[PDB]
Design a protein around this ligand. Structure first.
Ligand SMILES: Nc1ncnc2c1ncn2[C@@H]1O[C@H](COP(=O)(O)OP(=O)(O)O)[C@@H](O)[C@H]1O
Ligand SMILES: [Mg+2]
Ligand SMILES: [Mg+2]
Ligand SMILES: [Mg+2]
Ligand SMILES: [Mg+2]
Lengths: 158, 162
């Protein structure tokens, strides 16, 4: 089945990468709501926040979500896409949601902050769980997660 | 590990397609020996054949096989690669060999050294060369599956990237 697949998780969990790798395996399209926002508005999140604050950033993010959602597409979402209940509902409704979970220690170690990742997870862990259909060990290699997800979700390859 | 992985099997078995997906999944370089040969000589098979026939192309193919067999590389090989003993000895003694198996029917459906009905040729090719694929192969996998599944299977049976 071809419902949109939303990858959620905190900063450092490998959403874009795994998201892009899963899309390839399934023959889907791939879109990252942070990247889309940047390359369509011209603005960074610091640009958006400085001009309209976190509330205007959050609104714009919700709008991106609705804009990019479509079948045969994997969507990587920003880390705080799960703060707004309306966003959490939209994802379970339109598609299937996958949470890439990694403990703060390991989220911190990913740098291509451990106290900040710890507090992000105190706030959001529960929202990640609430919104997810499937939860997968994000500390594996991307290819391995793609494989595990095709098995768990029962998705055929391209 | 890091030793060259050789993809073998007959025309239509997916060596290039599956090889690139495997490379990509491992973060490894991919090479195809037919493409390597093209670019380092400038001659298409046809140019080579014209001058030195098929025995010539085989000679240059053997050479290329030895040129491209390096670490963290997935090497896709031409069909005929396994006819020579030297090529078989080389591959097992420098890397790990994967045989992408598929039935002749299926190899002929993929159409999208010729002779007669595609299907009948491929049947005969496979009937004689199957012992050769099996001999050289370390691992054998069902190439009728889609590429990303073949990759997943191969990563589990080969214990990669582990
Ligand atoms: N696992 C597969 N499942 C379905 N089709 C495949 C698979 N692998 C390859 N194909 C298709 O089969 C044909 C064989 O392509 P190719 O990769 O060049 O094979 P080979 O290098 O063995 O000649 C192509 O049309 C390719 O797109
Ligand atoms: Mg749904
Ligand atoms: Mg849940
Ligand atoms: Mg080929
Ligand atoms: Mg064998």
């Amino acid at each position: 089945m071809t419902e949109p697949i939303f990858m959620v998780g905190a900063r450092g969990c490998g959403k874009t990468t795994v998201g892009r790798e899963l899309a390839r395996a399934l023959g889907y399209e791939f879109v990252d709501t942070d990247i889309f926002m940047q390359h369509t508005s011209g603005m960074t999140v610091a640009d958006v926040v400085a001009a309209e604050g976190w509330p205007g950033f959050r609104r714009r993010e919700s709008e991106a979500l609705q804009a990019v959602a479509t079948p045969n597409r994997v969507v990587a979402t920003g880390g705080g896409m799960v703060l707004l209940e309306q966003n959490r509902q939209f994802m379970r409704a339109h598609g299937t949601v996958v949470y890439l979970f990694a403990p703060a220690e390991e989220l911190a170690l990913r740098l291509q902050i451990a106290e900040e990742m710890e507090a992000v997870l105190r706030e959001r862990e529960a929202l990640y769980q609430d919104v997810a259909h499937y939860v997968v060990d994000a500390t594996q290699p991307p290819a391995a997660i793609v494989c595990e997800l095709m098995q768990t979700m029962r998705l055929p390859a391209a």
